[model samples]
Target chain A: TTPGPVMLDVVGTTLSRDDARRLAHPNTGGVILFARHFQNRAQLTALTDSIRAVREDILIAVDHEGGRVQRFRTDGFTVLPAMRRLGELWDRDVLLATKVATAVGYILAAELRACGIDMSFTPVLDLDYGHSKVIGDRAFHRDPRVVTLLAKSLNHGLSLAGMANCGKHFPGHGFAEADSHVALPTDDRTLDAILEQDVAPYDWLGLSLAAVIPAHVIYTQVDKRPAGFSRVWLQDILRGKLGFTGAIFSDDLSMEAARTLTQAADAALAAGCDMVLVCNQPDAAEVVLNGLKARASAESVRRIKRMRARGKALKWDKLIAQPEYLQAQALLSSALA
Target chain B: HHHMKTTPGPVMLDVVGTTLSRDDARRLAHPNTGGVILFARHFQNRAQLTALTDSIRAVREDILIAVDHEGGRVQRFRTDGFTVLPAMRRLGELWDRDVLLATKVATAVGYILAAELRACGIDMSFTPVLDLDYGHSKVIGDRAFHRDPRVVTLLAKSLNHGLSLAGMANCGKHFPGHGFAEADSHVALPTDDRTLDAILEQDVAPYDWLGLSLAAVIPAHVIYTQVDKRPAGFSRVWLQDILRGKLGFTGAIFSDDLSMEAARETLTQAADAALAAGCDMVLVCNQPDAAEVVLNGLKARASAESVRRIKRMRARGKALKWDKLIAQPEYLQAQALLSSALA
Candidate 1:
């Protein structure tokens, strides 16, 4: 049987001894790591090994999109080019953009997999909403269709590496005037407006996704609840109406916006989350575990259990040895060169 | 009055009167009083600012009025009518995206800054800080372009060219450099101990190559102990011998502040040294009383050559005010590119 809603940890780096014990606990389904957690290839592999040892089905994820967001590399992973370069290339040669995006996706996912990561949350789908100090240069393009096409290409490349990919912060988190890490961003657009603009790409291509992470933002016109905690958006629109049966992961509950709508993790799952991500705060995770024990039903457990089947092991060393990886490395080197 | 020909000219007083009191109306009428700088609290609205300027001009028609209106966190007149501008790093990214567009936008920024201030009767803006952003310094982090000096020079030169077109005389700030200092001078004084040769080679090279007509150069309050025992603002060796002699800059030199702990160390020390170093104007802000003491303690008339240099800065300001700047086609195109990138 597969695991039900996969509650995860948001951590600065890969697991330590205590992290491994937490992952082994029945309540823990996954872990998120950042650049600070990794020192080198060997150390990363060791950390990933410890996570998988606790529960073979537990997923290990990272936000390794390359360019400014790249988490692991240096004689290990290929240094990926900035997304702006792709836009530059597209202006010159459309065929080249397709080729580079795929190669980048393959190199990115394959490298992380080799280090034992099950998946990466990547391929930013937000249309470059101008004026965001944080999202500048991180977005692939300003046009939604271009983002969709390039994201699909990048995701295809990720798929080829045998790892699942999560298209994130659904409907979108790009139009924010402030960084979500510091403030509660409210998306004023109505549901219909979002559907036409922000949600078009999701509706057209979500079938290809292994999972979706709802944004920790409130779209007042869409519904009063924050998107992460809204049953109307998650269950009615995303799951029931849209016919998405795949796993739905709530964004980190530790974010300021998420904390504002809920007391802790239970408020998220109670609102209709398949899995709650209580990151950064261990005390909150304990409270969430208690809630999960009290409320996880037979049907909910079965639904979560299905998520386990999506998990797979990455063969990092073999992937790194490939010629494709070497070529991608050269391309990234040329960007800065 | 100074023993006729034998005694020197009375020192130019920075204060309008003994603390701007109504009782000192006779002293306020003196021609030696030079300028006034406005702080954030001094301004309330456009009408108020206009009235303030009118009053200042009525008091002394030749006086220079200055303000620091560099956009982003340093902007003073926001929320009233000022356009919130993106940070300087955005300009660097635009330059990387399209150099032609970047310069055009730079010109527009200068036009916007100058036109808005000039409309309110401002004489000058202390802007286009020519410091290359050294990445590790939090004080100048995103305020600078890339860490490369060449890039900073190019971007700053574009901005200066824009200011020139907009009829505003600009100040190249914290002479030599302030980018490497991690601390803000507002809270505490910072020292840059690099040798004169090092500063001339790396930090000062941009100002040298740009050749932008600067109305004034504001020296850093920090001391470069190895180059001179005193702060650069108070060192004749730095201000005259190095800046004027070596750099050949024939513009007004201004000390940072007369009240800073760095300046307070010798009270009138910087005023004395700056005048001796050929600074045409010594600014004493925040303390009207201290300004009077400094005014009374010195000789006013500079060497005839220094007087000519000071008059020339005023002439440049006059010429700049006549030019009306607008966005070039290239700048409009950059805005389009920005819109497309955001779309």
Candidate 2:
């Protein structure tokens, strides 16, 4: 079955009967698990199994971006420092930073993939403008070039572990100081100024960037709407100008930036996002699923299918014992230290 | 037969001084210049105000005459027979004591406010600040009706109804709530960190509830961080998605003054952004040089739909003179109610 546009969430650590029914719905495309859905590795594996048992075609994803955003960090999940640490390491030793970024990415993807998760929204591409506290620690570096190379290295590591990575808050989110989780933020810079600086990474990353999650922040000079819900930003700029052919996932529609579920979903899809995320509210997510008449584009479906983990050979036990995993863990530790 | 122009333009500008200067007349005659917002500097007295408005109409009959006549601190006209209207918080306080009576007093305030403005030949007064009094923003403190969204909705609706009865249109302003933010847009850019759910459920509830009664909206310069980074006046997510789409507001959208510090850009850029963000009119007050640049540099055409909304804002029926208005039984009763209740 083709993945639908709506990405929703379940109730708890295990899928309830209601959760099963919602998963079985044709419009439901993916499941995004949070910290609440994770108790331990064995339980998480069981939950993933049950979720697949309900709908095997559904893409399983998580916001395992490390640091404050990382879910499932406890229960043997490697606790990674925020991306800014990697950026700091880059300032000192560029080669070592790239290696550590790859290691962190590999560990993140490998562990999650072992648990049957397909993708993690990783490697936030937002250039740190020093204003956004929400994005401060989350961003790798303020320099777009460093951000680009580091993210590419991370994506390479994800690829090695049979997991896809999504570069997020595209073209950038760090200029606006408002946390999108609570309030809408706007960047008033002209389009040329943004593209020359903050948006330069996407242009350089090329095909290594698999998917992009646009920012909720509006660039007033470019478009009136936020990047995620703007055709001018998503299609005209990201697709047409930057020439990114990857799938576009919207930031959570539950964010204050998104006015309402149905409108958010509709606007996001209309703006050329392949998949729309609606998390936190199952009732509202269902409303989006039922209300949205949007079908996934053929190209989007192909790109999304490519995002699934491939050539994976290790269970959690084997993954823990693997030489590369051990080496990566050590490198990550030393790099952070 | 003197009829208001069917199609109104989008630029709402201001003159330098009390009377219309030769250069000001030339600027006002520009095709893009649609309306004029009078300030305290323009108001010497009723006769002067009336003659100024008449002069404006002579330059272009379609020019909408507006003012920041939202009582108390924001009121533009106070002397020369204009009633000193109570701040909207007075109505909200009155609502706490008696809801129905407060609604009546609000209606009285609206009637007196609009009737007086219309009596001087002004088209509209940006009034009935629909922002919920969150007790946070000093700029919107007495301007807001009440903390309760229901109270604001009813009071604003009552006020709007009163305006309608008095042959005037009402604009519920600084939309999607500006009360939650502390910084004034006249100086620094204020940011509202509340979620869309929080704002819509609280501050923006009145706009949604008011519906067609809301003739126009002036989005706040304050940026709602949870919604969009840009101010509401320059955000399609707020103006298009939330206001026009979600809330179903089909009225004209007027951008708050572009000269304000929060606008944070050149006049041309501000006007361009506001228009692109779904504003029907862009207000450029204080600086006529910048206004002239906006008129010349900005590329915006008034949409037929926007023109229709603008035309709808023209004082709907013949307005009564101040003396004749005071003699009406409803007017006298409303005055008595406002005085007794608000006092």
Candidate 3:
């Protein structure tokens, strides 16, 4: 069966019988884990293994954005610095920053893939507009050109680890002042300005950007709907103008910005999103899974398949022994320190 | 027949100085020039202020006259008969003690502010900054009504009501909130990082709640990083989706002054960006030469719908003269209340 549109989260560290049943559903495409689901590295690896055992095609993902947003940090997961540190290094030494960025990206993806996880939505391309507290440390830099190069380096590292990277809050989310988890923020700028500045990184990254997650914030000028639900932003601008053929993932529908589950899923899908994430709420995810009548587009399924980790990845023991992994660990320690 | 030709344009610009120069008159006569925003430099006293406004109208009878009469530090026509209304934060503080009294005083301040400006033939005032006081932004500090969105909404709504009572239209400023950002948009391009959900629940709640009372809006120069990279003044997402789409705001949208340090891009580009971003009117202040470049270079045309909104912003009803205004019982009571509150 093709991967479905719904990517839901489980309740705890181990998959309950109910979760296994939910994963077996044909409509369920993937499972995303939070801190609540992670007890240790061994437990996480077992959980992911069981998830795949129930259904081999099921994609396992995690937040794993590093710094404050990282899940599974305690169990030998390298505590990475916020992306802003890399951006700061770029100001003083551009070459070193790029190298460190690649190292961080490789370590981030390699470790996750080693644990049996398929993808990590990371390498935030949002420009550091210096005001958004949520995106503050996560964003690389204020300049789009800098963000583009650094994120490209990070994506390259992810590729080295046999994992695909997703550029988040697409069309940019750095300009908005409010956090999407609490309220629906609105960006009031013209399409030209957004394309010229905020959206520049996405355009510059081009093929390097594997998949994209559109922001929950509404770009009122281009579309009355949020970027996640905007055909103008997703289809016309991202797909048509920028020629980004990658999968479009809707931001978590559990956020307050997403008013209704069914509506958010339908709107996100209709607007050209390949997957709609209903995180943190299992019942709501079930409603979305049942309520959604539209089948996954063939093109979307193809893109989702491509996001799976490719080639043979080193196991946790072998990965730790690997020179590149050891080197990356040292670089992360000094760079983050 | 003459009134039919007297529709207000959508470009709200500023004069060269206190009086209208020959060049200022010619620029104001341009069909695209809709309104004039007066500054402290444009006032010597009541006589000069009235004459300057008269001359501006003489150039174009339908030109809407406005001021940044938000009171305290932002108030433009402060001296010479204009009541120095207390900052909006004062009302917010009053709300902590007496919510009803805060509402009453807010309306009183609005009436006095609008009536005094109207006395000088000004059509509107960008008063009642709807931005919530997050206590972080030095620029928005006292200008914002309160930290609570609900209080800001009620107090702003009360102020707008009071302005309507005095025959003036109100413009709630810096749409979607400018309070959370530490940097002022005048010198720095501040970005708010919160997700869309947080902003709507807090800073932007007032705009959503104000409904019809909000006659127009001036979006912030600050960018919302989690939403869009472009500043609020230049972002379609903030203007079109949240303000017009979700909030159901049907009024005019004016771009804040494009001459500020944050908006110091090419004059024509800034003006064009604001217009393209859904601003019905674009303000070019403090730089007449650059303003002229924008007036001449900008390819934007005033939409008929936008023109209709502009016309609606004209001073409504009749205004009592300053001599007559102070004698009115309600006006005197409002003035008395303000003194006591400030004291």
Candidate 4:
């Protein structure tokens, strides 16, 4: 039951026949959930189970990085502290900050795993450069070393709950002012500066980082293509130089930055992405599924399947009773305050 | 059932000075003039403002009077009796430290701002900027409540409640959000290229959350290019399709100052465009000749729905005069609380 290369979405809280048909496609590798797809713990679990029934091997994921980026919040989900709060705590007490970060990640992972979610694009590796409103405060700190340590601690908690983690908008999204979701952002800094500051976290996080989503940003000094679409960033820089072996995912292909490119999924996979995502457009997802001729290599399939949750996950009812879960939630709330 | 069986006209124009001239009265008496938005040039003192408002009302009893009196840099009247209120960002910053106190300060600021202006004969204040502080737009800086939509909603609701308490209605402005785009509508036409989903999830949340409390809305002059080709003020897709149809916003929709550079069309055509796009009223300021063109060229009568919404924007009850307002314990306490907070 190896994963495929095409990751897409479903319709709502329950999987529809169209969604099941799409999910059953040979090219479909992952199912990404949105806020609209969630209702409650019981409902979300049911939805995830239905998704698994469609394809047991498919990687189920969400952008559940807590604070504002969290997809699911209400109805028993403990509102985790924003990553910036951890940086703030680090300034006050580094020891306590690490503990709170771990608690946030533990609670984040434990809750999602309980609902059968396999992964979350957590531990935003982007530095809080105070430029992109899109990345504002979702980032941990301006210092890359602190970002790495904090993310390593967060990944620690995620692994404890048998969940995997993703460091998003890789090579950096913080220095760019424009949102990749809406517009193409070009970082004009020299490659050395970016690797020194913004990309430092990616290099430092090491084996703790299970997945990496490349930024839809074009680093002008290095290449014309966005990091996701550029082999120079993904193959030459990320894979060859930085030596990142875990799964490499293209940021949502349907985003405006990648919209102009025809055959976006093919370009992304060709560039070095193990999996490419097309979300929010069923027709486009259908087209990618049907039209994509690119095959997932055994290595690609291995990396994609590795992103799946590592071990057994708890039911929501069982998770709530665990003292570990209870303690983490309390620690996170107090830390956030 | 309606006040005087009359509704205010659709065109909100400005006079040339603090004191009304002979031509000002003529424009005020125009059949299509639904409201008069006063600026700094219209304010000399509280007495002069009251006299100006009275004289304008004498010309047309049904006219609605509004000003940019949300405090901070936007307040039109500062001297003679107005409190120099802090910007909306102060409340947001306060929220980070103490949530309850922030809401309290927000409520007090709204009450004092409305009560003070009402005493001077102003009926409404275009207030409670629902725009988030993205820190991208310098023009919207400090005026926005906060970066978080939830915090913006709570603070804006608290502020609007204070406005409501003092017989003033609230208008959530630069609708959908003007914060993300870096351009100022006053000088240039800004474009927001974000998808409608992104705009709705963040910027439009306050308008939905505020619901019944938000008496009116002023759509932004910026173009949300992804959603519609036209700027929000002139887009039926934004006004009718999104704000009214999707959000179920029963409140009035006023166009952001058509006089701003973003309006793009000629004043007369801009007025027509905004009106056709579902605005209850079109504001024309600092361009008397253009305002005249709009008032003259717009031969159509106010729509029944527009009239109904416009009339609802009028002050709800009697306002204490300046002397009486200055002497009241509630007014004094609210002012002191705001003064202390700002200080």
Give the number of the best model, judged by lDDT.
4
Error of 3 at B74 (Å): 1.5
lDDT of 3 by residue, A1-337 (tens): 6688889998788888888878888778899999998888889899899889887888888888777789878878888888888989989866567667777878898899888999899879898988787798999999987887678667756765667789989888899888899999888989999898888878755445679999989888878898898999999998888767677888999998877698789989999999889999887798888889775488888778767886567789878776457756766676556
B27 in model 3: Cα distance from truth in Å?
A: 0.4
Q: Better model by TM-score, 1 or 3?
A: 3
The TM-scores of all predictions, comma-separated, are 0.46, 0.50, 0.50, 0.51
Instruction: Candidate 4: list runs displaced more than 4 Å.
Output: A1-337, B1-6
Off by over 4 Å in 3: A1-337, B1-6
Q: What ranges in model 2 sit over 4 Å off?
A: A1-337, B1-7
Cα displacement (Å) at residue B161, model 1:
53
Cα lDDT tens digits for candidate 4, B1-343: 2244545779999888888899988888778888889998888888888999988888889899999987687888899978888889989988898665566577678878888888888889999899999998988899998999878876786677567656677899889899999899989999899998899889988876554556799999998889998999899999999988886676788889988998873888888889889898999989886798889898556777788778767775567788877886456656666666556
Tens digits of lDDT, candidate 2, B223-244: 8888898999999999999988
Q: In every candidate, how many clashes are there?
A: 10, 11, 48, 3
Native A-B contact fraction in model 1: 0.00
Candidate 4 lDDT by residue in tens digits, A1-337? 5677888988888889999998888888998999999888889999999989989888999988877899999998877767888899989866466666766777888889889899898879999979989988899998987787678667766765667788988899999999999999999999999989888777655445678999999999999999998999999998878767789999999999986223888889989999988888876788888888666478888678768775456788777775456656655665568
lDDT of each: 0.62, 0.81, 0.81, 0.82
DockQ of 3: 0.01
What's the lDDT for candidate 4? 0.82
Per-residue lDDT over A1-337 for candidate 2, one digit per residue giving the tens place of the 0 to 100 score: 6777888999998789889878888777789999999999999999998998998788899998888889988888998878988899989966567667767887888899888898899879988778999888899998987887678667756765666678889878988888888898998999899999888877755445678999999888889898899999999898888667678999999999877688778889989998888889898788777788655477677666666666533789878875457767766776686
TM-score of chain B of 1: 0.81
